[PDB]
Amino acid sequence: MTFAKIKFSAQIRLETGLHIGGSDAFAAIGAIDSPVIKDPITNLPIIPGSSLKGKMRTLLAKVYNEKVAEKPSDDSDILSRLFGNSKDKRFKMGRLIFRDAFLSNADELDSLGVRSYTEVKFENTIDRITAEANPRQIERAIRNSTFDFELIYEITDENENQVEEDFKVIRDGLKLLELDYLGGSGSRGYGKVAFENLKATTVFGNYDVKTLNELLTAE
Amino acid sequence: TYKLYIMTFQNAHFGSGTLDSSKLTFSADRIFSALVLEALKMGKLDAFLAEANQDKFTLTDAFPFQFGPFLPKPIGYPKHDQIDQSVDVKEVRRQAKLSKKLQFLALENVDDYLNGELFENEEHAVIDTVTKNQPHKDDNLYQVATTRFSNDTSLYVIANESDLLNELMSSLQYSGLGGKRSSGFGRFELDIQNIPLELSDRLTKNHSDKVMSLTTALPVDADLEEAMEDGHYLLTKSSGFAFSHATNENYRKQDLYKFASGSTFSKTFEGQIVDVRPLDFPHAVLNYAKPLFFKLE
Amino acid sequence: MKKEKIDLFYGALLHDIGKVIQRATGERKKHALVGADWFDEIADNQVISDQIRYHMANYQSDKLGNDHLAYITYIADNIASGVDRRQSNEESDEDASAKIWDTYTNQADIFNVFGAQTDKRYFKPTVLNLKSKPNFASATYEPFSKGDYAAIATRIKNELAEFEFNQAQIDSLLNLFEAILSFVPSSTNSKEIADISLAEHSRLTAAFALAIYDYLEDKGRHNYKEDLFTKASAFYEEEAFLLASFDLSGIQDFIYNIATSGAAKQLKARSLYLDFMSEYIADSLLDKLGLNRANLLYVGGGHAYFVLANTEKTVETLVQFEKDFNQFLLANFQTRLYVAFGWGSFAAKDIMSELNSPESYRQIYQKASRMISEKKISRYDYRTLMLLNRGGKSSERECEICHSVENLVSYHDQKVCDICRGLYQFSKEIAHDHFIITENEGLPIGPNACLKGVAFEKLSQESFSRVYVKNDYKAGTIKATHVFVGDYQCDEIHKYAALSKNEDGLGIKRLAVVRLDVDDLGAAFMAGFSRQGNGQYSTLSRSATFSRSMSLFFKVYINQFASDKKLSIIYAGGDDVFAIGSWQDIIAFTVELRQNFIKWTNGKLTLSAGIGLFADKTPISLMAHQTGELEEAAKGNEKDSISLFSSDYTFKFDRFITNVYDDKLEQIRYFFNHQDERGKNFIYKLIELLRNYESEEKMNVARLAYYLTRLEELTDKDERDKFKQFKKLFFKWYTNNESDRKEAELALLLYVYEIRKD
């Protein structure tokens, strides 16, 4: 059935401080010893699409991989047909086109009364034999910040009987990412996100996203 | 020759040969390959191939578009016949360095630059590099350079008004262009505009005057000698690994040296949709090097 | 070269050693006679001896034949002088000679006439040494000393006692000249300024003598007495000289495009290899014309200038070597590297000062620049591009360094091309001092010629055609050509990230790359001397000594500026300086280099520097690209500026030294070294207030006042007063203007980089 493209618009809303990090050139001058990745122009916290893609793939590797995934190249057919796989014929390019995530409530944050869009979390480590506390500082994209999340799944004539399984995979990836962290030191209360206004709309071509939206939202 | 396809970008990575480099504008080969791949994956490959093989088809390199169609600096026309000045050598070298640093002129002042006027570059995009890792074996650290545009700068391409090309463009605006398209980099939004009345009369394919190529084009052997014997030009390599679904291993597609933009020539010539596939491999790689010219003074 | 040509060369180069001998001994005899009978005491060669004796045309010219080489040498001296030496009447009056010649004045600084007028400075005559501190010109070094000349005379006598006047020794002797007479004035007459070194003057005289001999041989004119002495004024109008040049495009892209580990060794090896390729281009072009290194005015950064004889033969060899070396470069490096040659015809008249037009002066160089640019725009013919586009190769794997597909080989489980394998081998051979040109062994440096670095003890076991010695002023047992590069290396590049930490663990684990460039160096070459004297100071002598001074500062002195520092100078030639090291030592080295450049050039030439800060294991191409972007951003700030770690922190360089490093950073260190964890943590709040000032100006100055006085109240009673001083000083910085605000922010950033424990 003919070409189609389906876009999963959503609003990532950090419930806990996000620390995707990765200061290289611009964010490298942050004077924090762990700056969050920012926009080079507006100095705004950004959730790169690579983080979302990698975290979703690693999360779905624990559900839709019957064999043990020693390498991402040895992933199951379902995962490699969406996220791609460099070492096979049919699955060389995946069906998922992730996009970066930019701050969308900066004006709302100004209205609330914030001065900066990235707080500084102070932590420390306690030695076990001695008890001297070694302190440290790490940046955190403050909570209640929204990012525009936009993922497109392509529907091709040849890959048509696998649409429902793929849709279940995106659902199970987005709702696993809502349960696990999103980058950063997540095992210490970090990177907790939530996808608000989770809505799928066909954009190019035509498809019955009306059956998908009802099973996407709520349940 | 007919339209002024504009594409607003927010983040893109057009490799210059290495993954750590990212050019401001993509060449015509990249967009032609993207369109061919989109037509192949949709199903209508043969229609696009037939349209491309026709002489009516046109495509140009991506050029900046910021409140007015911008264009490539004409290579070889800072000519001293309109650049003779009585200033000291300090100012002469300063203006020579400024001209060499310039890479894109505005359509409103292209003829002005041909008269000897001096112009400067403008804030279009910032080339930033982000470092990422692979936490599956914890022994990887790669870097990707991007070209995040601002100051409301878009990119534009000149192509014919055709339902197929418009459909492929609209399908491409949610597939990205170049680089890690399935990682965030490359996406854009399409708009279709009419060529301004100060450009359509000069955007040409055939006269005998001096015509700036607006495409990375490679003449056929019939008129190559006449092209370089009285021409000013630049050479670019279209090398790379050929993306293909019919091999388990990547193959280096054949290297190709093409005339960049804006290369000035004394006359027009004919391009080529050249096969650069490695030997003994059924489906080929098509490299688009077909001229779209600009008439000058 | 012919034996007659060699004798002419030696007579023209050694015709002014008599000045040195006269100044060392104090004798009142004419310098020509003293040089001649000193030559007779060391060598039995009548032609060179009487060329030195009779280079003064007024000294008994009737005793020389009409075809004598001396009539060439003499006119060559007048050409290398850019001044008429007859019209002065200094040549026939001994009493007036004793009054005009001020032999009690040392060599003046070439920059005394550069740009605007300032205090005159003079160089004390010293022998160049690779490990000796820079010889700075001073206004107190004007008086002449015989003791300095005594050691000069002793060394030149000792070196020339057993010297063989043969072609193979030629370059060696020239190096001896550069070692000795680079700070000895050529002339001491009061009416002129003694800013031409005698070594450079003699080198120009020899080059012009060889060019005149070639031009006259082509024209079939052997009556040198009639042409260059009887009709010297008429010959000054003849269009007999060429100022040629070549530029190699692709050097920086070839050097810095490395994508894999081991980029360090490849990077330094590529820099040295391109420098040696430019040197080989110059040497082979000179050999094809039967000339020597005296005709070489400048080699650096792939840019080189020659002075040649204007003949159809010279043009044919120029175009033939152009085609041959471009064919070799197309065969080995494809289109990555391309050499472009140009040449501009000029006459003697336009290099004098009584006959040169400053327009003409520049015009001499100009034509060649326009022709080189035209040949750079239009590179290859139809055959070349049709051949390069032939394709037909089915390749699955590529080179992992420069992504080449030609002649891939396996090395360390990695696929590299032949050139990459050659640079792999050459990186281990950089440590040697001698580099030979063989026919097949080593990195392909030219048509049927390869470069190979081999130690001294093995030099007897290899067949070579030309030998280069790197950073050596001593005439060794092997007749070699001496080249100088900036190649100080403290450790391997991957260790500089760890080397930044001190013994106590302080210091960020990051490296830095500095790219530095002298602004308007080309304008300095072209019109720097025309500002004074209404353009009369524009002769080839002044440009040549400016070139030699730039080479002296940026090829050997930078090695001493890098001493005891954890850095490696990858590329230092002409105006571009590229170094990688620990960030503290890199910034240190940049500050010292510019301070000494300002002191060296008397503030006439400024520097723009970019210092990028990077993490361990970062790709080197990306390093160079970001640091060059910062350098360009610094160039944008009306030049003379430094860009530290970002285009945001762009400062005037003198302001950076006076205000940022030793004024704000010193006070911040003095304060926060005496403070506990809380005060050190307050630095981040200070930086955040500095960055946010524009949005909330008055609320921010309020907040800063609060934070400073709360730390006041938190400081101990004994340490309270110093805090009051710091609080007042920092509040003054914050409320003064944006420049002091940015300077304080940069000082805080540097300090927090210094104390970081992680």
UniProtKB/Swiss-Prot annotation, chain C:
Q: Name one GO molecular function term.
A: RNA binding
Entry keyword set: Antiviral defense, ATP-binding, Endonuclease, Exonuclease, Hydrolase, Nuclease, Nucleotide-binding, RNA-binding, Transferase
Q: Which cofactors are reported in the record for this sequence?
A: a divalent metal cation
Q: How is its activity regulated?
A: ssDNase activity is activated by target RNA binding to the Csm-crRNA complex and is inhibited by EDTA.
CDD domains the UniProt entry points to: Cas10_III
Q: Where is the GGDEF domain?
A: 509-647
The record's Gene Ontology biological-process terms are: defense response to virus
Question: From which domain of life does this come?
Answer: Bacteria
**Is Nuclease one of the keywords?**
yes
Q: PANTHER family, from UniProt?
A: CRISPR SYSTEM SINGLE-STRAND-SPECIFIC DEOXYRIBONUCLEASE CAS10/CSM1 (SUBTYPE III-A) (PTHR36528), CRISPR SYSTEM SINGLE-STRAND-SPECIFIC DEOXYRIBONUCLEASE CAS10_CSM1 (SUBTYPE III-A) (PTHR36528:SF1)
According to its UniProt entry, the function of this protein is described as:
CRISPR (clustered regularly interspaced short palindromic repeat) is an adaptive immune system that provides protection against mobile genetic elements (viruses, transposable elements and conjugative plasmids). CRISPR clusters contain spacers, sequences complementary to antecedent mobile elements, and target invading nucleic acids. CRISPR clusters are transcribed and processed into CRISPR RNA (crRNA).
Per its record, how is this protein called by name? CRISPR system single-strand-specific deoxyribonuclease Cas10/Csm1 (subtype III-A)
**Organism this protein belongs to:** Streptococcus thermophilus
Q: Which gene encodes it?
A: cas10
